[PDB]
From a paper:
We produce a sub-3 Å cryo-EM structure of the cauliflower mitoribosome, which reveals details about rRNA modifications and r-proteins, particularly 4 distinct plant-specific PPR proteins. Given the high local resolution for the different parts of the ribosome (up to 1.8 Å locally, permitting to place ions and solvent molecules), we adopted an unbiased approach to rebuild and identify ribosomal proteins. Beyond these PPR proteins that are specific to plants, it also revealed the presence of a herein identified r-protein. This protein is an isoform of [name], that we name [name], interacting with both the remodeled domain III and mL101. In angiosperms, the [name] harbors a large extension at the tip of the SSU’s head, rooting from h39 of domain 3’M. Here, we resolve this specific domain to approximate 4 Å (compared to the previously reported 8 Å). This allowed the unambiguous identification of the two r-proteins located there (rPPR6 and rPPR8). mS80 (rPPR6) is positioned at the base of the head extension, whereas mS81 (rPPR8) wraps around and follows the shape of the head extension. Most remarkably, we could identify that the mRNA channel exit harbors mS77, another plant-specific PPR protein. It wraps around the SSU body, rooting from the SSU protuberance, where it is anchored and extends in the back of the SSU, close to the mRNA exit channel, where its PPR domain is located. Finally, the improved resolution reveals the contacts between the LSU’s CP to SSU head via [name], [name] and [name], and unravels the presence of ATP in mS29, as also found in human mitoribosomes. Our cryo-EM map resolution allowed us to identify in total 18 rRNA modifications, 6 in SSU and 12 in LSU.
Mitoribosomes are specific ribosomes found in mitochondria, which have been shown to be remarkably diverse across eukaryotic lineages. In plants, they possess unique features, including additional rRNA domains stabilized by plant-specific proteins. Among these, the [name] ribosome (called mitoribosome hereafter) is an essential molecular machine that synthesizes proteins within the organelle. We used cryo-electron microscopy to provide a high-resolution structural characterization of the cauliflower mitoribosome, in translating and maturation states.
Author numbering:
A (entry chain f): 33 to 204
B (entry chain C): 17 to 266, 280 to 362
C (entry chain A): 107 to 205
D (entry chain D): 70 to 263, 295 to 517
E (entry chain e): 139 to 384
F (entry chain U): 2 to 48
The structure:
């Protein structure tokens, strides 16, 4: 159709010789993940894993922000309208993408070139390679919004040395 | 006339009985063909003129002295594939393929003399094209001689091809004296029945079965057999190593396991053995597109011919200069 | 390198008799700033990789045949550092095999 | 084999068995009433089952005429196998090569059963593993083909179709890989004498190394030696240099590759002028190919045409290119190149078209494995510049894999779309 | 413990003694692989006699599609085999004795003396013409399997070839029985004259893609719709919107 | 020869097509590929 021209702009693809890069380009929301963005990302990564002409995949972000987490305003307005189905579908799509990232058959590399919050770490930290820069800032302020560090953040924070996972998940 | 074409083509393209003198000539002709094949590295005209002219001559002889170059030049196509596939649907060619007759000139004489029917109507057009659905038969007063000659062709075919060269590689004169006794047995229906039900032909059949099995190893058949059965072949070695560890850390079992593993390793790793003895050339049956009932005899066309199943004795590398076929896919390409 | 199986004859004290290598090298490491030898041309002719230090004024015909360029001025200290790093890496990999 | 007396025995037994069955059926009928008009004069004189009696009379007459040697072999009639021309020494060397490997294998399995210590048992197990992984190792492609054949015997319908096509492709690839592997020394020859090659090269390598150490030591002791001893060391060094030169000559054996066809493109007489007259030599241009995408060429000059062809034949395997083909029968797209003043056009064609080319282009395209290409040589038809333009054209084709890597995008055949 | 080793040796001996069997079924599968769809086995005359019995007994259950699936041949060959067996029994009823079949049993008992090529299913011959499309950079999507597309092409060509065979074979069958003239001196006028077969031309007379609508117009002044034979005549003379397969 | 590309890609295509036997250095180059830098447009700036 023609209505998905905004989603294809929100999740761009750059192709190289044997590799593909997914780029987050939602500068209004600081690259916050919506349901169509997660659906497109899941479709792209499934097709790239199936393709034997692609060696490894990438995930980048455009702007000063890598990914500011999930776009919760749409879920808030959906919960205000009574039905809870939209939030549900967004959540199993996001956790399905995180599970795909954790079990991915080819190498995957994330370039973290800015602020990473919430599920932004959840789509990248289960990957095989992770590149951090001097602009990379990682925080988990889910307790200060009334929510919990989901999207696999209870997997990798709990495996940090000592009790640093608790400090990060409680203080943000 | 026709034996002299062997001197032109340096091999037995004539298909009648050779004398002693003609066999002595063929020895020298095949020596010439061997010395020419070694000489091909230093020949500028080998591909474009020599091999192509010899292949075209062989194809003309194969289809009953037809002008193959002229008729193919009538079409504007470079490759011979559609031309040869169209030739296989001719009425005289099909009458040769069904083994209702022995040569193309016999078939042309029978069709021209108004003695073969297509869909119960007499058709005297030797170049007629038969499409799928056509029914071929003979005349009612003609079919009994055709049945007798078809039986004679098949039984003297087994006696003159499958018995002379398969394990009875006898010298010429004593085999010619021996053929009288073999011909007397075919005089009766009881003799043909008893030759069919005999342990002689059963041993010949079993040896040819084993011989056809051995030729499959040139394609790496035994390696595919090992690849199918990799897990249990490994499990045999796991069992041997487990037994030789457990029952040794503190002997018929060891000898039995060693004999089994060595038998399996020999059966799966032995290379293909191409022996000195020449392969017997077998009569082909056109069952991919022609359905035959040899009792009357009658036949029905139900499909189209195949470019890889035309029974010419031309090598693939020579004939590829005319066909230009991507061989190996099974298609008419 | 391209004619390494050619015969050689002893003459005198001379400039000393040396034969070519018995095995063809799998790599050539070159320190030829003034291009006094035909090493890069013969190695490119024989499909052998070349590790060399490249000056700013290297010709395109020589630069095209250098598989592993190292852009530097070939000072004594840099050649020492280059060779020390090469030596240490080679013998650290070689000690990992029992050798 | 089967004795001819055994054949006479079995045919006489068959005729006897015919007579015994006839008399037994005659007895069974005649005891139960049943007159035997269908037994007498219906299996004896008026059977005529094949119409073979005139052939018997014709053969009987031709067997009582001439004399020769009755057991003399002659030339066969249905001979001309024509693919039975392979050098038998390599094949009878394969047999005892496999036999020596198998005997070594049997010896290690018998040594594994003769151990007493599990440290020794583990050591001989690792020796067996290193032997089997180097001499009795099955290629992984055959494991893929075996798994696919396992799925195929229980497949039906669309799956049976698709698996048959996939295994057809795999069998073609493994046959090609086994026939044209450069790592197998069985895929090489000698050329006319101008693991056995492995060890005969290793012994010469060790001899050359020993001679080089000896030469270095003698040059070392020559540097400090003056007088007649210096001359004696000089003569000793010259003898060592002669030995090393001869041993270096002995390693230069040119090899040809099996499964390749080599063809002459051009043999020319060239000339040079001196004060004594014209000096005439021959140049030979030749091409080679394995019909599977590998093509090469060489040009040589010698005193005679035969010698020039021989030098080019020895040189022809030293510059081999790999050419990508589309579906093993044509080029991916239309290509136009020029080398000097020779312009070459090549056009891809569908699968029943054929090769439309002049002899130089046709020979090179045939040896590279193409089947359906149209071509045109425009301008100069210098055969050597034509060869070079053909190689320039075939290396400038951009395959769908090349486009896919160059642009970072998926390239699809249009009929699969 | 040693009983486990004995069962392991039994598991090894049941395989090693049956290696030659596995090589035999592998040879048949190799015949099917190297020529895709080739059935690798040769169909015997006794199997065709059994096919004729199963068709004559229960034609509603043992149909052409079922007999083709069971004996792994094409439906065209099933129709041909059934016609030839019908003719064989008509000839043996006219003769009074069963026909001689020496050639058939020589072919049945010793198939290894001969080469056969009898096919199971149809594989289409593709013009492997290079023609490519570059997808967009952000294309998510799955390329089709070329074996799947080859299967669909082959099945379409199989359906076409089957119906063309059916039409030509039924026409030749009732030419064999004697309902088609085919000889110019057997085409004679009736006592009232000639029947005609009148086709309606133009866009307003079309019966569909294939030609115009037809009626008969008898010599007595009456007209009638087409018969079944006349319907076959209509169907066989239509233009076909394809190139010639085989 | 007439093949295009650098040493690595040309050697990969030759080895894959079974034209040349695999050299010893081919795996060492594939493990540590020669370095690549972006296009620079050739305008060197005065420091
Ligand atoms: Mg001119």
């Amino acid at each position: 159709s023609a209505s998905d021209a905004d989603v294809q702009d929100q999740v761009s693809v750059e192709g190289k010789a044997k590799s593909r890069a997914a780029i987050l380009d939602r500068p209004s929301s600081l690259n916050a993940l919506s349901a169509p963005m997660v659906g497109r990302l899941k479709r792209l990564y499934e097709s790239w894993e199936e393709n034997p002409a692609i060696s490894f995949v990438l995930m980048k972000g455009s702007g000063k922000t890598f990914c500011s987490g999930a776009d919760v305003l749409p879920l808030y307005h959906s919960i205000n309208e009574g039905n809870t189905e939209e939030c549900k579908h967004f959540f199993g799509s996001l956790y399905n993408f995180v599970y795909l990232q954790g079990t991915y058959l080819k190498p995957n590399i994330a370039i973290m070139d800015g602020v990473t919050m919430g599920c932004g770490g959840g789509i990248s930290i289960p990957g095989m390679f992770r590149v951090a820069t001097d602009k990379t800032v990682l925080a988990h302020p889910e307790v200060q919004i009334g929510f919990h560090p989901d999207a696999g953040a209870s997997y990798y924070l709990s495996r940090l040395p000592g009790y640093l996972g608790e400090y990060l998940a409680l203080t943000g | 006339l026709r034996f002299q074409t062997c001197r032109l083509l340096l091999g037995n393209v004539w298909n009648r009985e050779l004398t002693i003198i003609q066999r002595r000539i063929l020895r020298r002709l095949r020596n010439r063909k061997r010395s020419i094949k070694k000489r091909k590295i230093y020949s500028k005209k080998y591909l474009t003129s020599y091999i192509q002219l010899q292949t075209t001559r062989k194809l003309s002889l194969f289809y009953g002295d037809l002008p193959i170059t002229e008729m193919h030049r009538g079409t504007k196509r470079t490759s011979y594939i559609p031309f040869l596939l169209n030739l296989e649907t001719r009425f005289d060619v099909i009458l040769l393929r069904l083994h209702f007759l022995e040569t193309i000139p016999q078939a042309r004489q029978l069709i021209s003399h108004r003695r073969v029917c297509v869909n119960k109507g007499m058709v005297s057009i030797t170049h007629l094209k038969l499409s799928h659905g056509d029914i071929i038969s003979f005349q009612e007063n003609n079919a009994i001689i055709r049945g007798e000659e078809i039986r004679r062709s098949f039984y003297k075919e087994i006696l003159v091809e499958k018995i002379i060269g398969k394990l009875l590689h006898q010298p010429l004169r004593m085999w010619r004296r021996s053929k009288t006794e073999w011909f007397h047995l075919l005089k009766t229906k009881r003799g043909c029945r008893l030759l069919l039900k005999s342990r002689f032909l059963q041993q010949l059949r079993s040896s040819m079965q084993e011989e056809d099995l051995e030729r499959t190893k040139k394609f790496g058949s035994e390696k595919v057999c090992l690849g199918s059965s990799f897990a249990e072949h490994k499990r045999m070695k796991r069992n041997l190593l487990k037994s030789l560890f457990l029952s040794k850390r503190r002997p018929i079992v060891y000898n039995s396991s060693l004999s089994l593993y060595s038998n399996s390793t020999y059966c799966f790793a032995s290379p293909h053995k191409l022996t000195m003895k020449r392969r017997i050339k077998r009569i082909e049956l056109p069952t991919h597109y022609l359905e035959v009932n040899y009792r009357t005899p009658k036949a029905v066309v139900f499909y189209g011919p195949n470019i890889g199943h035309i029974p010419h004795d031309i090598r693939l590398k020579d004939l590829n200069l005319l066909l230009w076929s991507r061989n190996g896919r099974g298609q008419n390409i | 390198l391209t004619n390494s199986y050619s015969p050689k004859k002893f003459r005198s004290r001379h400039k000393k008799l040396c034969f070519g290598p018995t095995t063809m090298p799998d790599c050539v490491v070159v320190f030829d700033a003034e291009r006094k030898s035909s090493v890069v041309l013969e190695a490119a002719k024989l499909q052998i990789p070349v590790v060399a230090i490249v000056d700013p004024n290297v010709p395109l015909e020589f630069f095209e045949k250098i598989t592993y360029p190292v852009p530097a001025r070939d000072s004594v200290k840099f050649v020492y550092l280059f060779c020390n790093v090469i030596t240490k890496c080679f013998v650290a990999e070689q000690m990992k095999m029992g050798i | 084999t089967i004795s001819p007396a055994e054949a006479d025995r079995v045919v006489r037994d068959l005729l006897a068995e015919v007579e015994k069955e006839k008399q037994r059926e005659r007895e069974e009928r005649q005891r139960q009433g049943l007159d035997c008009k269908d037994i007498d004069d219906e299996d004896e004189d008026e059977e005529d089952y094949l119409g073979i009696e005139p052939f018997i009379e014709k053969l009987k007459k031709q067997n009582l005429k001439d004399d020769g040697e009755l057991n003399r072999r002659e030339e066969s009639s249905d001979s001309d196998s024509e693919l039975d021309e392979v050098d038998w020494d390599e094949e009878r060397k394969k047999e005892d090569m496999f036999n020596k490997k198998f005997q070594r294998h049997k010896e290690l399995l018998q040594t594994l059963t003769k151990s007493e210590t599990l440290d020794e048992a583990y050591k001989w197990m690792t020796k067996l593993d290193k032997f089997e992984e180097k001499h009795f190792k099955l290629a992984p492609e055959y494991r893929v083909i075996g798994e696919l054949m396992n799925r195929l015997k229980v497949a039906e319908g669309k799956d049976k179709f698709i698996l048959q096509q996939k295994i057809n492709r795999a069998m073609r690839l493994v046959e090609w890989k086994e026939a044209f592997d450069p790592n197998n020394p069985a895929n090489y020859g000698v050329i006319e004498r101008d693991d056995d090659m492995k060890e005969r090269d290793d012994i010469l390598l060790e001899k050359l190394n020993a001679i080089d150490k000896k030469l270095e030591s003698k040059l070392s002791e020559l540097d400090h030696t003056f007088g007649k001893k210096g001359k004696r060391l000089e003569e000793e060094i010259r003898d060592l240099a002669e030995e090393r030169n001869a041993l270096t000559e002995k390693k230069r054996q040119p090899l040809y590759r099996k499964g390749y066809d080599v063809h002459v493109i051009d043999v020319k007489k060239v000339a040079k002028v001196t004060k004594g007259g014209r000096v005439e030599r021959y140049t030979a241009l030749m091409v080679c190919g394995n019909y599977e995408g590998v093509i090469g060429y060489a040009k040589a000059k010698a005193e005679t045409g035969q010698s020039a062809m021989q030098k080019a034949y020895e040189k022809c395997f030293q510059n081999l290119h790999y050419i990508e083909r589309h579906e093993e029968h044509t080029i991916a797209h239309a290509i136009q190149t020029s080398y000097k003043k020779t312009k070459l056009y090549l056009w891809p064609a569908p699968t029943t078209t054929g090769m439309k080319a002049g002899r130089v282009v046709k020979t090179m395209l045939l040896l590279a494995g193409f089947k359906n290409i149209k071509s045109k040589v425009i301008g100069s038809r210098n055969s050597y510049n034509t060869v070079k333009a053909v190689l320039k054209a075939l290396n400038a084709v951009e395959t769908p894999k090349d486009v896919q890597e160059k642009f970072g995008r998926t390239v699809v055949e249009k009929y699969l779309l | 413990m040693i009983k486990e080793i004995e069962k392991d040796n039994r598991h090894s001996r049941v395989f090693v003694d049956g290696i030659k069997q596995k090589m035999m079924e592998m040879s048949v599968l190799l015949k099917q692989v190297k020529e895709p769809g080739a059935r690798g086995s040769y169909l015997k005359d006794s199997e065709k006699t059994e096919m004729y019995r199963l068709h004559k007994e229960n034609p509603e259950v043992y149909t052409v599609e079922r007999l083709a699936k069971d004996y792994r041949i094409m439906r065209q060959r099933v129709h041909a085999i059934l016609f030839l067996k019908e003719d064989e029994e008509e000839e043996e009823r006219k003769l009074g004795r069963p026909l001689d079949d020496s050639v058939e049993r020589l072919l049945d008992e010793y198939p290894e003396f001969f080469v056969s090529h009898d096919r199971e299913f149809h594989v289409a011959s593709l013009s492997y013409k290079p023609d490519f499309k570059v997808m967009p950079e952000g294309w998510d999507g799955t390329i089709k399997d070329m074996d799947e597309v080859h299967y669909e092409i082959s099945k379409k060509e199989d359906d076409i070839l089957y119906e063309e065979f059916l039409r030509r074979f039924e026409f030749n069958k009732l030419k064999w029985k004697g309902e088609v003239k085919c000889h110019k001196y057997s085409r004679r006028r009736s006592s009232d004259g000639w029947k005609i077969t009148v086709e309606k031309l133009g866009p307003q007379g079309k019966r569909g893609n294939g030609g115009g609508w037809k009626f008969v117009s008898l010599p007595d002044g009456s007209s009638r719709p087409l018969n079944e034979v006349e319907k076959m005549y209509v169907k066989r003379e239509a233009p076909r919107r394809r190139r010639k397969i085989l | 020869s007439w093949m295009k590309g650098d040493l690595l890609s040309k050697t990969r295509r030759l080895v894959g097509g079974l034209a040349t036997r695999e050299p010893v250095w081919l795996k060492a180059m594939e493990a540590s590929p020669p370095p690549v830098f972006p296009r620079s447009n050739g305008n060197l700036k005065k420091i």
